[PDB]
């Protein structure tokens, strides 16, 4: 008896978990690489997008949207996806 792959008695397909909206999910990107100079901060890399969660000062709470890490981050290091030149 020759070899072969799996093969169930039925088949189906649909789109995957593709996202929506943006109005209340501040996607920023890191302008530069950062490595928590002082306590309670995220360490991110240049071109890490992050979902900002609080924005009330020069430092913002965010989550690395590539890796689901969280922390405060420097707003000078960073920039809204909606505000890029690309």
């Amino acid at each position: 008896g020759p070899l072969g792959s799996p093969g169930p008695n039925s088949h189906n397909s649909n789109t995957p978990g593709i996202r929506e909206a943006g109005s209340e999910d501040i996607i920023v990107v890191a302008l530069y690489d950062y490595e928590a100079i002082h306590h309670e901060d995220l360490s991110f890399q240049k071109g890490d997008q992050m979902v900002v969660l609080e924005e009330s000062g020069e430092w913002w709470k965010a989550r690395s949207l590539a890796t689901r890490k969280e922390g405060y981050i420097p707003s000078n290091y960073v920039a809204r996806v909606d505000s890029l030149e690309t």
Partner: peptide
Amino acid sequence: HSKYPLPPLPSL
């Protein structure tokens, strides 16, 4: 927060 007067930006 405003814990520090921002980090020192890179060499660019």
